[model samples]
Target: GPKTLKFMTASSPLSPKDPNEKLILQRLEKETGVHIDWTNYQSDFAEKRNLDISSGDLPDAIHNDGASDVDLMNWAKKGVIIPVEDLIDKYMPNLKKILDEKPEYKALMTAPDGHIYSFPWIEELGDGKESIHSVNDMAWINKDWLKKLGLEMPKTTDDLIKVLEAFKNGDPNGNGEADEIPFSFISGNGNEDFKFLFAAFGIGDNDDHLVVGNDGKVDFTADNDNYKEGVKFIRQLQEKGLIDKEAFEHDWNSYIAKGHDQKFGVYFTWDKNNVTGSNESYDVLPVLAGPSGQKHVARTNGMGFARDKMVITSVNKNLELTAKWIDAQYAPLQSVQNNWGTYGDDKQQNIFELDQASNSLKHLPLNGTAPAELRQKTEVGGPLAILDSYYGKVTTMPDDAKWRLDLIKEYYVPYMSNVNNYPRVFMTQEDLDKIAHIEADMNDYIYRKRAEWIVNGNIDTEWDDYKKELEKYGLSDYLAIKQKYYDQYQANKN
Candidate 1:
């Protein structure tokens, strides 16, 4: 006889009419004949999850643990979580099939201890150049303002400066006011910042501050000489009154306000809708040609994938039942619903609709609603994968996602010369500990200097001193460690 599975999930509780959540409860109960005593926690999920493990008040399993690789490794070493490899092989046939078919997944999920600690959530709309996450922070220009000032689209970095200067002096917004900001971007948020502009100068222009050199050495982009040059150029823009002074300190709401009021000549964001709404007055600017006659856009080393979705606790008694229930999430139809909102709901706009005739899932029209907002409203996220081949079998990709993927392919893919981005490598506990120790100080220093250089404009005069500080802060050693691990991972690739 099976006992009630006490499951702890991170997402908020959903209403009865939410089709996705309803489906999850139905499927889990029906398939495993196990009643679920679900405890839902919204805010501070990670802290709560950690507390649960630390206090030995662990549930039967954590459905949405949101544990990072570092957490997984550390927890497993401390006997806080069970390794799912044997349990998966014995009871999780659906997930076993996926791992067997894709050996790369097996490699990725395995930790340094040669054990699988957690289940993964994988979504792959495209690979390499076509990935939706490959680029961020698109520069958008107010075309209406540009036309009002009788200026052509800027083709070069110099041309961009001139246009920005014209916007500042001529008051392109034109309400008998001088409220227009020529250019603006958030400082530290990876996707919303002016990282793309740094690519025009040279190799130090990546979003993650990590880049694989042509010689196969991994280097922090911030430590490169070209990065210093790019910083100087941006400082010059700030000095010339082309960049917004408030960029370093403005919040998302304030940034969006500027866009909505049409007070910005240009700005940066992942999508224009969140910033500009539906004004149709702005358009994405092309990569500006640099002084060296190179026109390039840096391909971000990002993937629309996360591996740590679910993890079984060491205290779980019904391993067989729990493993079987977890396997159900990987079922094609179930996975589709888990990854996105499901269909046949009267209350909310469905993320997908079931095609009875073809017995396939069809994407529902979202009408430009953001996916994250909709997912929070309806979807019950868990272990699921949207592989490239799952498009027809599981469900059609959402329209907006497909549209964004196409845009990446057509607009940004061609300019990306580098093929290698960072790979998902399982680091040892020691390596992770070292990385964790250094990253806190390293990231703070990098971001602080970026803000200072952009606003104060003396980076060139203090360039040598800055490099010395980076070395003193263990940047060179950090690069060497990452490079070694990367090489080892690549060598093991099929």
Candidate 2:
């Protein structure tokens, strides 16, 4: 008999229409005779999801479960969401085959309880340097301003200072108003921060609060000596009026507004298109050499692969049907559409178009349009995997994504020395508890001090006090836990 599947999803207000949702529902209804009744929640999904679980008014399945590892484990322990291991093995042949082929994924997906409670979203574009997520916070310079000021691209920190001074004093924006911000960044924000400047000193900085040492050991970026130098460099910029005064206080919107107004001589972000708009006014800045004569760019440990996508509730009786439908999402052709967007729709602008002549999906030219705008307008993000092997079989990678990947490989990957970025480790309950406790205080302290140092300067004067405060806040213990887990991970890999 056909069954009705109730699904809940969390999405931003600006999220694009779920084109694939309609497609999947139509296919599932026709194939398995199941009616999918979906509820879209636009607010704090974590609180609402927990409330739903506590009230036992759980949906049959929650797409984009959005729960943390701790939440997943706690719910699994309390019998809120049923473990999908058996269903995955029995009916999720496509996903099961993928896990079998990639044991690393199997280890990553497995909980501390040794059960796989949720489905995963895996999209791997490149292996090493070519990976799209390999780099973060690219520093961009206004090349037009550089030419207007009669200055070449900065190669060293001193050269950068001179360039910033010129931009500040010479009025590079050509308005004769001296309104240009020489160096601007949204401090403490992942994609907008000035952390990229730290690379010249040593292991450098990252928002993740984690970094792998040259010796294959994981270390805290904030606790490193290079971090102090990074702070000093920023203070130097501050002292000379080369940095934005509002950088420590402004949000992304405010930052983008300045960029749009062409009031910034230099800035940091993932893409200049969204920040400065799709104009030829900005160019990617090369890694600057520091006083130590070193030039390096730290690779961010962010890869957008998530191991928890969709989780089925225990109240759901039609496990086989749900598993089969979930499995379909992992199919080569299906995943292509699930990730980007589907083809053959004239009414709505799609992410891709199917080339019927070649039986392949080709990315539609986005031109200067925002990727998120296009995706939210059409794509469906659910349980899907566009593996490294699926490139030719399913579809070519999105043109913009492919271009970004190639740019990363050529411009950034060559500078990365350590091969190991942070791996997605499924920590134990005890460890997770410690992380929750330490991270809250630790992150706040790091960010607070970063702002304080940039605005007030003299971090060296406050170094001992800061170190003592960090110790009190459990920085040492946090480092120990991270090191232990990293060592264990290396041993397991070997």
Candidate 3:
């Protein structure tokens, strides 16, 4: 008989009603002699989770909890969740071994108060300049359209302008309605925005308006002279009607609608398949030389890591059994299957095939199914670690991921100038609160002004006042705080 420990977690609407029915969890239970009695929420997970908590109907633990730094600290202070460092030391050897080798992750797991409140999810695809996350909001241009019009791939900002002009007037889609959206992007959309083009002017931009200099100084990208030049360039596109008019107002639904119609000549997204389908018509737009004749790519401060994936509640009676059961998820092959889908499923599609001879999983082709949709249906979302070393040993990299990484290494990695990205530094509750408070007003103003300047075209006129207002909004204090933490992270690593 297996010991049962109750847990509350969220699952995709597409997944099975009971997570235990999934082969991944079934194998986990078989290995650990424990059964997770899951109370799985399919939608509005946070709202329902809080409702359960407020009603005092707590579970033994929460998996895929998605708690924020502040929420974790608040729960710890209230004694709702127990600290897990001691449990890891005693029972979680799989995770402890990971922490031992990667001291950087251990530092990130430890909160300012020196207690570890949660288990982390770490997935490292690449490191430093060649990281898969080095550039999001990647510029993807229509190669079929270019080949149809007999135009070359754009190599400079000026070249891109000419190419976009051709797309607008040439009717490359052959419907003959002048319906081509020369360049389309969703304003303020994290991976759909026009920030990729901003690099052609200067320091470029990212979801966070912050970039670190090679000298390790933290600086804002939006309030600078080069950023103003980027805005002015965008204004030129808007005036020429090359930029999509509905860009500022379109949601994901509206944006994807146009994309599926194959109406765009250029667009931005993490994957073109998500937007325009996998027709091979579009390819990654090359990094264009800016006005200064130097090309650059702004690395995003993103990593496939999260610290609040799972946490045990104080109400749990079997801490040792619970910890050991969760620890199984960190095993190399188990982590691979847990993060992705497992092999040898009798039903539905499988992401991998079990090569029993070698005892390794081999990636099965995605065929036509979207990678994300398949994983959502099969993966048991919980704490896991898949280091870069796991690929080619425990499992092969998914074909899509391997293809994209090759593209990044070929096209963008060479131009990345930053030596550091803002690491995931754990901070005090007070400091997190302070940082959030300042960003609330400051970031809103920055984004609003950026959109205004691109569409309405008065950046040169309003630049000084905008900078003044940013200073008023405590830009200096924001940078100081970020710099302080970044320096501390560097020192710790050393």
**lDDT: which candidate is best?**
3
RMSD of 1: 2.8
Work out how many backbone clashes candidate 3 has: 0
Sequence-dependent TM-score of model 3: 0.94
User: Which residue pairs in candidate 3 collide?
Assistant: none
TM-score of every candidate relative to the true structure? 0.92, 0.91, 0.94
Off by over 4 Å in 1: 1-4, 13-21, 100-102, 346-349, 366-374
Clashes of each: 1, 2, 0
Per residue, candidate 1 scores C-alpha lDDT tens digits across 167-235 of 899988777777789989988857679988887786646656887766787768887777887888888
Model 1: pairs clashing at backbone N, Cα or C within 3 Å: 120-307
lDDT per residue (tens digit) for residues 222-254 in model 2: 877888988889889999988888888888889
TM-score, structure 1 vs. true: 0.92
Residues 43-86, candidate 3: write the lDDT tens digits: 99999998887787989999988889998998899888999999
Query: Candidate 1: how many backbone clashes?
Result: 1
* Deviation in Å, model 2, residue 406 alpha carbon: 2.9
In model 3, which range of ten residues has the least summed lDDT? Answer: 363-372
Candidate 3 or 1, higher lDDT = 3
In the predicted model 2, the residue pairs found to clash are 16-376, 16-377
